[PDB]
Amino acid sequence: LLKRDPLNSMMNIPAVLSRFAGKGLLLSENGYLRWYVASMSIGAVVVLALLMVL
Amino acid sequence: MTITPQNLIALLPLLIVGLTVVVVMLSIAWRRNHFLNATLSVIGLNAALVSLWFVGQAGAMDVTPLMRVDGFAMLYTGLVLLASLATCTFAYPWLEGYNDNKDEFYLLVLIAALGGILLANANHLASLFLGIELISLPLFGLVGYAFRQKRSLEASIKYTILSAAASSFLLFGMALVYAQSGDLSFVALGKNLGDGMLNEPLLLAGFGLMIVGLGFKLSLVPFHLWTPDVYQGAPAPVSTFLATASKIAIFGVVMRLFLYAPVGDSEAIRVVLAIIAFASIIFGNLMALSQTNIKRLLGYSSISHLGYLLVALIALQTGEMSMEAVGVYLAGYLFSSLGAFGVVSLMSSPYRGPDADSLFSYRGLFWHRPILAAVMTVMMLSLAGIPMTLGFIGKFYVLAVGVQAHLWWLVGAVVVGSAIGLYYYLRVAVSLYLHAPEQPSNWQYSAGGIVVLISALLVLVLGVWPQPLISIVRLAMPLM
Amino acid sequence: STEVIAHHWAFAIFLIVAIGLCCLMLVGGWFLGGRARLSAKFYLVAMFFVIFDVEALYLFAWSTSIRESGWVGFVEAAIFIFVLLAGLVYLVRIGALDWTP
Amino acid sequence: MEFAFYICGLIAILATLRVITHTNPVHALLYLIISLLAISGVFFSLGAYFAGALEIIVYAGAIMVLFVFVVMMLNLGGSEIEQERQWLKPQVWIGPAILSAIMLVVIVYAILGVNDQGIDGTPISAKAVGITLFGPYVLAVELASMLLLAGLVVAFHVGREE
Amino acid sequence: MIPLQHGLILAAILFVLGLTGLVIRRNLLFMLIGLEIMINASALAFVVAGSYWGQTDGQVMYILAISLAAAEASIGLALLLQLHRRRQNLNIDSVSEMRG
Ligand SMILES: CCCCCCCCCCCCCCCCCC(=O)OC[C@H](COP(=O)(O)OCCN)OC(=O)CCCCCCCCCCCCCCCCC
Ligand SMILES: CCCCCCCCCCCCCCCCCC(=O)OC[C@H](COP(=O)(O)OCCN)OC(=O)CCCCCCCCCCCCCCCCC
Numbered sequence A: 001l002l003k004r005d006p007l008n009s010m011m012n013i014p015a016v017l018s019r020f021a022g023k024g025l026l027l028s029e030n031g032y033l034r035w036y037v038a039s040m041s042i043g044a045v046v047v048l049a050l051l052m053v054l
Numbered sequence B: 001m002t003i004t005p006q007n008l009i010a011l012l013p014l015l016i017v018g019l020t021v022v023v024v025m026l027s028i029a030w031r032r033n034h035f036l037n038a039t040l041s042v043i044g045l046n047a048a049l050v051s052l053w054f055v056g057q058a059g060a061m062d063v064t065p066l067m068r069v070d071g072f073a074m075l076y077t078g079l080v081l082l083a084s085l086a087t088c089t090f091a092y093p094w095l096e097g098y099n100d101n102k103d104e105f106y107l108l109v110l111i112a113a114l115g116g117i118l119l120a121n122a123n124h125l126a127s128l129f130l131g132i133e134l135i136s137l138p139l140f141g142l143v144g145y146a147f148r149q150k151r152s153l154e155a156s157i158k159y160t161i162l163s164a165a166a167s168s169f170l171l172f173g174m175a176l177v178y179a180q181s182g183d184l185s186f187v188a189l190g191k192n193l194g195d196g197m198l199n200e201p202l203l204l205a206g207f208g209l210m211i212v213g214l215g216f217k218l219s220l221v222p223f224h225l226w227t228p229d230v231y232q233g234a235p236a237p238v239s240t241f242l243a244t245a246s247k248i249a250i251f252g253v254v255m256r257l258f259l260y261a262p263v264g265d266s267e268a269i270r271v272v273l274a275i276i277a278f279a280s281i282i283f284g285n286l287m288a289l290s291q292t293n294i295k296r297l298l299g300y301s302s303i304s305h306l307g308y309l310l311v312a313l314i315a316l317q318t319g320e321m322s323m324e325a326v327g328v329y330l331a332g333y334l335f336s337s338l339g340a341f342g343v344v345s346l347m348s349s350p351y352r353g354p355d356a357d358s359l360f361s362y363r364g365l366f367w368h369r370p371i372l373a374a375v376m377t378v379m380m381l382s383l384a385g386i387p388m389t390l391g392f393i394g395k396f397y398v399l400a401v402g403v404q405a406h407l408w409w410l411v412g413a414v415v416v417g418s419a420i421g422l423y424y425y426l427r428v429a430v431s432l433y434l435h436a437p438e439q440p441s442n443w444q445y446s447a448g449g450i451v452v453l454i455s456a457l458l459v460l461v462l463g464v465w466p467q468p469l470i471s472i473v474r475l476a477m478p479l480m
Numbered sequence C: 001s002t003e004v005i006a007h008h009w010a011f012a013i014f015l016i017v018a019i020g021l022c023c024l025m026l027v028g029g030w031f032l033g034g035r036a037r038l039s040a041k042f043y044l045v046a047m048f049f050v051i052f053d054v055e056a057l058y059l060f061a062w063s064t065s066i067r068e069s070g071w072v073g074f075v076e077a078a079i080f081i082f083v084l085l086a087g088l089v090y091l092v093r094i095g096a097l098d099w100t101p
Numbered sequence D: 001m002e003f004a005f006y007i008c009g010l011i012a013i014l015a016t017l018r019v020i021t022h023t024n025p026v027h028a029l030l031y032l033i034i035s036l037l038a039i040s041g042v043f044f045s046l047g048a049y050f051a052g053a054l055e056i057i058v059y060a061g062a063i064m065v066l067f068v069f070v071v072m073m074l075n076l077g078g079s080e081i082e083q084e085r086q087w088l089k090p091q092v093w094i095g096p097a098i099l100s101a102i103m104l105v106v107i108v109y110a111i112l113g114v115n116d117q118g119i120d121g122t123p124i125s126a127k128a129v130g131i132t133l134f135g136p137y138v139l140a141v142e143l144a145s146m147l148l149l150a151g152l153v154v155a156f157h158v159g160r161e162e
Numbered sequence E: 001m002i003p004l005q006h007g008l009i010l011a012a013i014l015f016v017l018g019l020t021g022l023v024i025r026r027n028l029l030f031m032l033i034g035l036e037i038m039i040n041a042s043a044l045a046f047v048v049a050g051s052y053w054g055q056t057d058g059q060v061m062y063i064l065a066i067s068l069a070a071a072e073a074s075i076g077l078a079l080l081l082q083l084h085r086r087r088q089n090l091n092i093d094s095v096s097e098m099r100g
């Protein structure tokens, strides 16, 4: 039962999480200028809302 | 105020670079000569770099209501001038293959260097806005210098529209800040507040829109999506300039803005910048995990490294070594990016027309270009914060600054992002040392190789002995 | 005041009567009577006009306050006009302003 | 000057709203020229006489002359986009509408909480602007000349014919 | 007796209308139109701020803003002309080759 090294697998789990997160973030680099402007507007809204809350 | 001959002595690199712009333009008007105009541009940039000595002998004082010249301005002027000189040196062999006019490149590089000098000496919202624009517009021209190439035209269009949007965001932010305050100087952005009322709503909104524009110009998340496309589509010397000089100058003027403003120690801006720095580090490292092109990989690298710089910036008021950490990190990152983008530019030169693909194909580089492979892997180690390299000294400075101010989330983010960077930087290095399936000779190509070799030797030597760099950064201290 | 508001009302009546006169002329013309890719040189010259026009606005702002700015302002505007003429010489000498090649 | 300011602002808002939704490029440019004249009237209402003069001289007399020049150079008769009308369908424009409405709400909430003594509208002449332009703002003028030179060189290099 | 808040609100309305026009229109010329609207709204906001404080600084930065606007419109229309020359359409969704 242990020959597959379960502790090594559980410590390699963060590498798989990082790979999945990198793929999910790279989905947002679609190359569309309208999406880039929309993301800048979204970030402006987010920054302003955070500054108004705090 | 007014203008003095002593103020003219403190004006020396700006005047020298502007005179070089006029001289090179008149020389192009006389006769289009590539070698002569490139020589005139590098002579003017070296003259400004030498006149930094006379600026230092003149002292530190306020040349205009707009400009303030001190040691910090000298250091960042020197960094921007070195980046511009390296850009010219890498650009000459690339421009040897360009069928259209090769002479406007150096004119635009000189004008962008002038904007970088203005940003280094900026002490005002007017000078900051003008320096940002004076960096951006020649970069619009340089990114799309090969407009017949489709990728470069795409990068130029994306950069132009997005940076016009960011400049308008920054302008509206300065408008709200000036409406709240009434003074445009850096020292008075929140001076008319008191008794714990530093979190003025209109001032916070104006600084937020300014943060939007500057975080575009610094590739900070979520204003970061332009960076890999513009870095890939642009010519490789343009990628060198855009990665080094623009980022260094804009971060320096952001450093002065957050040091001199009485609203720079507001907790809301501090938390917003902490969120942006955390997201920038993590996202820029995660998106470079599965990148096969070196330009997009270096763009995500720039995102992560500007996140590290922002972490060093957040602890400005709490800590005392934050500016010196930023200076050491910026010198190390400048040399590492100069070497990496110089290897890219030397292996992508001459420009073989707008039809042939500009793919790098870094695998197996050692077996036909061994010295470039050694320089490139030294840069890849240096960007990873691995010791024997100056990039490790910068990472150590960022970690020490974060530990001093108890920014533990940022310290953990720095460590996690450093591990992810270790993965992809080391993958690039071992791919350089693998085996490839299949596999210039002028003195300017040799000069570019000498530049990247000197950068590699500087990175190694100041990684094993960083005390001269620490001393000459601590000598460059702005007015308190 | 009285003279200033009178001049403002006179200018307003000037605008109103001019617009009404042109509109009435066109209405009378309509009612009366029985019934039955360019080259890049145009962009280049318009762009040159725009750039030299904003540099002209800088010179407009300087010209109305020459005596209050002194010889220092003359030196600064001389540098400005020298850069203007260097740009103009650069444009002419490379054939940008030549309509025919 | 109060009634002039509000009517010019309303006209500018309505003309800009017509600009961002129109499909004909020349009609959109005409509405934006109307908006620029309205914003110049706003400038004249607030005493910024030089700013309004340059708004009609340069913004509504040079830059969109260049825009109309480019539009008639391209002979844009509404091809391959006027046949679509994609931005008028809800699924394209409602999302950015909420984005801009939220940003406007946040900026308005920030604006309403500032010290406001009112604008007296005292006319700031172009002589004072020229004095400040060549006094405390010398390097701004020189580096703005360099900036316009850079834009000239860039636009010449990109917009050639060959 | 014109409030500063009203002028700033008008400028913010024009800025967000320009941003909406920049986002929702795929035509590159309408995006350049939106960029002109946003930078003119920023310049108007600065003029309002300078007129409230009774300073020429607002008009000076208005001048710098429109210098930037003129040069940016020049570069943007040159890039638009080049795009229409080499691909005959102004739809920017075609110009999306770099991704990932
Ligand atoms: C016991 C708990 C308490 C103590 C915790 C101590 C933490 C620090 C020390 C342990 C670090 C663990 C790192 C685990 C991953 C090691 C790297 C690895 O697995 O590399 C191999 C893999 C590439 O090979 P392959 O599997 O083929 O991937 C296909 C990709 N082409 O590489 C990849 O796929 C790259 C994946 C991204 C980079 C590696 C993952 C980094 C994650 C952050 C590490 C820092 C620690 C964060 C906290 C961990 C949890 C506490
Ligand atoms: C009637 C229904 C609507 C009809 C269509 C729209 C027509 C235009 C309406 C708006 C503009 C004109 C408003 C009326 C102005 C009349 C004069 C006036 O009120 O002047 C006051 C002030 C004078 O200056 P000041 O010295 O401060 O005066 C204080 C007095 N001691 O004045 C000032 O300070 C400046 C006054 C405004 C600036 C000059 C006029 C600008 C006009 C811009 C037009 C834009 C295009 C409109 C297109 C409409 C159709 C779409």
Ligand SMILES: CCCCCCCCCCCCCCCCCCCC
Pocket: B373, B374, B375, B377, B378, B381, B387, B388, B433
């Ligand atoms: C930071 C310390 C130095 C890091 C490395 C810098 C580059 C040194 C390059 C020297 C030459 C390397 C030769 C490798 C040959 C591999 C052959 C493998 C055969 C199976």
Ligand SMILES: CCCCCCCCCCCCCCCCCCCC
Pocket: A032, A034, A035, A038, A042, A045, A046, D095, D096, D098, D099, E093
């Ligand atoms: C073919 C590619 C087309 C890309 C179109 C991109 C359109 C983006 C629209 C974004 C809409 C956001 C709406 C508001 C979201 C919630 C508020 C902001 C985040 C907190």
